[PDB]
Design a protein around this ligand. Structure first.
Ligand code: AGS
Ligand code: AGS
Ligand code: AGS
Ligand code: AGS
Ligand code: AGS
Lengths: 579, 564, 182
């Protein structure tokens, strides 16, 4: 009775009502059955990603058996899901595994009606060229009943075929696609009463919907039927636990809180409508960055067109970050990544100074099958492949060899980008920011904080002259970045100093600073320039403040409630008297 | 009732007050409960690293069961731990624990309230495998029975799911955090009277505090619930032992001395001079490696910021050193280990220049960090390292989180990481005077960025560029090498003096020190004109001991009266 | 037994571990040829010299053979009859008896099974304190083969002595060589 130890009797579970209802797989079920109905090599295989409901297909078939919706020869069939891990774990000895596996094969061959197996990843039986995978579902499989329903990740299917041949002759492919968000919801709806019964809760129909939507957007590593169900089952658990600790599985709140825990994203104010309207990109970016904030509005306009659904779905929003050096080029770009995609980590930096004709494109997209390195994607596709909500920020684009720019422009128009290995990535949901300081030299004329037309058309003039015009025509907008007012520097300094307080995670220590005018002016004066940005402010704080503090901490000259010493250079004051 | 011998009613033990309160750990416990409440992937597993506090979590769970702070679906459930030891210890012959084990599960499955089992050693599924790889969990779970709370460390968990994907459908990966030292102290305070009773030694509250501080400082790869408690139990044993030999209290410094003697490293002997030398690290180092004032400054600042707790907390002192050969790139790395941990050996070599992921994964991810947790890691030619190496380095740079073994994290933010590259040599070799000059240094960063993404450059505490090792430095270096040569003489008879030491120095700097090889030529010239000639005079029995060296032009060894 | 030289702390710590409650059961772990047996020999001498804490003052230390099991399996289960005999006797009444196991990896048996009750119920209760020792590499083998031993035994890494310390050792043993060799 080896099947009683190594396999799950799916048929009896079906009979007992222990299997989930199956939604959206009728044809996969029919196909699985169709193959099983065959006389010879009746061995279908469910090929596709883990988490897409492949078990559901099997469970579906098991139910068909129970309800007698099965072809004659299969009506009396019993299904067993064979656990290959259980069979091999702890095997050690020469023929330990071999005996167990043969054991279940014999039980199948030995009279007890038709038994069909479900294999927990058929590719695991590749072996070291068979040999070690012996007779494990080999030739008997082709004729002597022993019908097997296999399953595998498609990539591994390919490997078992290429490294075996006979396997291909023995199995029939059935490909299984991942459900769409809507279909996912249909699945969730079919299963809704099972969750309500198990948890003892009420599930809003809309909860099922928002779970599926969040599943796609924030937990992409999982398949939709996997993720959405986890969101539902977890929220329901959440409600049951919290409720009972001292039933409304709310579509907004319980789904969001669960997602927050699973995604590492606070349950923010960022409802889709706020994001679509970008109300807060203006408000938050206005707070996060300084200078002429109307540049934000220009960006927001492009974004809203894509958010409205009116934009061509294949044309990612993009703009040219054209302007003054020192203006927080990457600060803004990171902050818009921050707000727009709800994470600064979405930013990808691409260095376009490193782009000679001979290799430029391959450096960004990766070299091809054969040449030095297969680290496909270099800078672009190897990040885009994981972060579809990323931002591509390109430094010094004006120096890029034109072929790169051509690839980039194609990446914007019907914006599917393919790596050097032929891996299509697709940039449709990405925001692209090309950047250039080409015109910074005109802005540097210092004609007030706001760029006047008298320089604006020199800044953009140079760009229009420099790039062949389609460069600009294929970009949603060109946004011009203005000069900081002295007050802008003061705000940056205040922000940075606050960052230092946070730097001190060990918040037993912090600054009071004092000299909030004199030290602030020392610092701000040293950083108030178009060719500086905060680079010197950062350096002064790292050195004149923190390295000097380290000396004072080490000498017990400073303990906490820390203050600054300015002679105008800068160091910190002694608080405890050399203790 | 096999369970009367093999199932421990953790719930009842909590009811009777047999289990300890646990530091606010409840937040994680609530996630355990939520998982048990689930329909799908209903078996949580407590996953972490030694000192995880796994049992403590379970004890907390048991207390919640007593409070019945659970969902209706889990309500009234009892938590029973399995006596895996007795079940298998009594396995006189094949089939004995197998039937007892299954017996217990079958009894657990019926009548005696809903039961969730706690299964420590969950990796046993891959050990007591074969039939048991299923019997232990699967058939029961296939009936909706036997919900369990499993537990193990990251190494095991990963191997379980890698070997058996069933666990990704049957279990939830409940990661467990290291507690705050404040929580650790709370643990220690709760245990304080137990320790007093155990040893007859009172523990000073500030001793409980320092144990947490010390443990985190010297054992980055062990969690506080293990290591801080060891410091207290060791120190208490220490005091008891001292008293057994000849108030009976553990002081903070008792524990400090324990840590020092326990590890051989004076973890808390932060004498004023420990901090003052840091103030003077740039000064002291300039006599250990010569000059290179800008490089030793970069190091000193990073170390001073790390030691003082000012460096971004997620940034171990860490450097990428650029320079020409003979610059002292290696020597500084060693002198930093010398200076900071009182031993130049407090470093770990990694052959980055020879890495490829297929093997780098085992060649790098090893146990050296378990023996020298404060070391200066020496990664040679990281520039040509496989991206896998570099990727793990990003994990390392982010608070020392080096992945090791089967998934064990080091967290050595108290270690120093030194990486080397010659990438910047492209412009360092401009040799524009002495100190790296304007333009050259910018070009160097341009060179650095050829292989070092912002991913590294904005995590490393400093990219450090060595200067042309100048003639001024050479005069001081010569003094060091001449000293070294005497030190080198393991055979005591080879004792010498340098006549005209200054002229020897002149020759070493003048006909030795190539501008392009740093101090290399000093080592070579001494050998070329001094040691070579000595070897002959030694073999010719001209020189025995207290020999001296002269200078002509051509170094001139003296000749002693015939060898004695 | 040669008069252990220089291992002052190692002995103190070995004993302190016996004095500890948590993982109160030390093993000397390290490179082969550094004196780990010498340290335990040192413990025996220190007990004899009455330079030890009262908890092991007058204690008796024994080195247990393979023969505890390898006396002969003739009679399946005799391995346990003998090992249990010994474990009981060691715990049995006669002041503190301390067990020395040289190359503790032998206790692993052929992958558990044969290991039977070797120190299983003993370690489980903090009884029969054992001072063990093994090659660092074997230590790692034990951690994988048994696991429980790592959770019960205290790991004490023992370092190689310096050249100067080595000279002190040689000096201390010098008369044994001079006498033996003439
Ligand atoms: N279409 C569906 N009908 C019924 N149940 C579903 C459906 N999709 C998902 N589920 C449930 O959600 C899970 C999806 O799991 P699957 O993708 O079948 O797991 P799997 O097929 O074993 O892949 P792995 O390798 O075990 S993740 C199942 O365990 C079902 O409980
Ligand atoms: N307009 C701004 N808003 C917010 N922060 C700014 C702004 N301008 C400069 N900064 C600061 O300057 C730093 C960001 O500089 P980056 O954008 O990387 O460099 P840059 O300012 O674009 O020009 P370069 O080429 O580095 S001089 C951050 O530390 C910001 O705090
Ligand atoms: N946070 C805590 N609060 C109260 N008691 C604790 C706490 N942490 C640990 N303890 C006590 O110390 C022990 C916890 O040890 P375990 O969790 O079994 O060891 P561990 O943390 O699992 O290390 P591993 O992984 O088994 S080597 C228990 O005996 C608890 O009573
Ligand atoms: N600043 C210095 N002070 C004293 N000795 C030095 C100094 N710089 C170099 N040396 C000598 O240079 C020798 C070896 O130099 P290293 O620093 O190893 O060469 P390097 O610069 O590290 O090049 P790599 O990449 O490590 S071969 C040492 O053994 C010292 O004798
Ligand atoms: N510190 C010491 N004092 C006295 N004798 C020592 C010392 N260190 C080593 N020895 C002698 O040198 C040998 C080292 O023996 P051991 O301690 O067994 O070696 P080990 O470290 O046990 O490696 P194994 O496992 O026994 S091969 C012994 O024969 C000791 O007599």
């Amino acid at each position: 009775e080896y099947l009683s130890k190594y396999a799950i009797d799916m048929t009896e579970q079906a009979r007992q009502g222990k299997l989930d209802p199956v939604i959206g797989r009728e044809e996969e079920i029919r196909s699985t059955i169709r193959v099983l109905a065959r006389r010879i090599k009746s061995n279908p295989c469910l090929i596709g990603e883990p988490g897409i409901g492949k078990t559901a297909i099997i469970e579906g078939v098991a139910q068909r058996i129970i309800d007698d919706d099965v072809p004659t020869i299969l009506q009396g069939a019993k299904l067993f899901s064979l656990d290959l891990a259980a069979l091999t774990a702890g095997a050690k000895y020469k023929g330990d595994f071999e005996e167990r596996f043969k054991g279940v094969l014999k039980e199948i061959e030995e009279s007890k009606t038709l038994i069909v197996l479900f294999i927990d990843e058929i590719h695991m039986l590749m072996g070291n060229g068979k040999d070690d995978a012996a007779n494990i579902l080999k030739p008997a499989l082709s004729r002597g009943q022993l019908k097997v329903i296999g399953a595998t990740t498609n990539n591994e299917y390919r490997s078992i075929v290429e490294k075996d041949g006979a396997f291909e002759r023995r199995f029939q492919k059935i490909e299984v696609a991942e459900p769409s968000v809507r279909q996912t919801v249909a699945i969730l709806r079919g299963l809704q009463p099972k969750y309500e019964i198990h948890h003892g809760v009420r599930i809003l129909d809309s909860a099922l919907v928002t779970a599926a939507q969040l599943a796609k957007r924030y937990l992409p590593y999982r398949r939709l039927p996997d993720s959405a169900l986890d969101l539902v089952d977890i929220s329901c658990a959440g409600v049951a636990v919290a409720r009972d600790s001292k039933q409304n599985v709310v579509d907004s709140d319980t789904i969001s809180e669960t997602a927050a825990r699973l995604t590492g994203i606070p349950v923010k104010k960022l409802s889709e409508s706020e994001n679509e309207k970008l109300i807060h990109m203006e408000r938050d970016l206005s707070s996060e960055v300084v200078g002429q904030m109307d540049a934000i509005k220009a960006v927001s306009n492009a974004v809203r067109l894509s958010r409205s659904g009116l934009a061509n779905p294949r044309q990612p929003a993009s703009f040219l970050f054209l302007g003054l050096s020192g203006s927080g080029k990457t600060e803004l770009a990171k902050k818009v990544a921050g707000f727009l995609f709800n994470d600064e980590d979405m930013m990808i930096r691409v260095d376009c100074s490193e782009l000679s004709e001979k290799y430029a494109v391959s450096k960004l997209l990766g070299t091809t099958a054969g040449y030095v390195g297969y680290d496909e994607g270099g800078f672009l596709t190897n990040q885009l492949q994981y972060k579809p909500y990323s931002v591509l920020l390109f430094d010094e684009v004006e120096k890029a060899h034109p072929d790169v720019l051509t690839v980039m422009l194609q990446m914007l128009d019907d914006g599917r980008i393919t790596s050097g290995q032929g891996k299509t990535i697709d940039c449709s949901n990405c925001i692209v920011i090309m950047t250039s300081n080409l015109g910074a030299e005109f802005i540097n004329s210092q004609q007030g904080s706001k760029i006047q037309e008298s320089t604006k058309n020199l800044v953009m003039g140079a760009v229009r002259q420099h790039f062949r015009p389609e460069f600009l025509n294929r970009i949603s907008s060109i946004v011009i970045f203005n000069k900081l007012s002295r007050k802008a520097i003061h705000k940056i300094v205040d922000i940075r100093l606050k960052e230092i307080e946070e730097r001190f995670e060990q918040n037993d220590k912090h600054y009071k600073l004092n000299l909030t005018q004199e030290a602030k002016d020392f610092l701000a004066k040293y950083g108030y320039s178009d060719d500086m940005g905060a680079r010197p402010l950062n350096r002064l704080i790292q050195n004149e403040i923190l390295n000097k503090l380290a000396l004072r901490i080490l000498k017990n000259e400073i303990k906490d409630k820390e203050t600054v010493n300015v002679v105008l250079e800068e160091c910190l004051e002694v608080l405890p008297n050399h203790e």
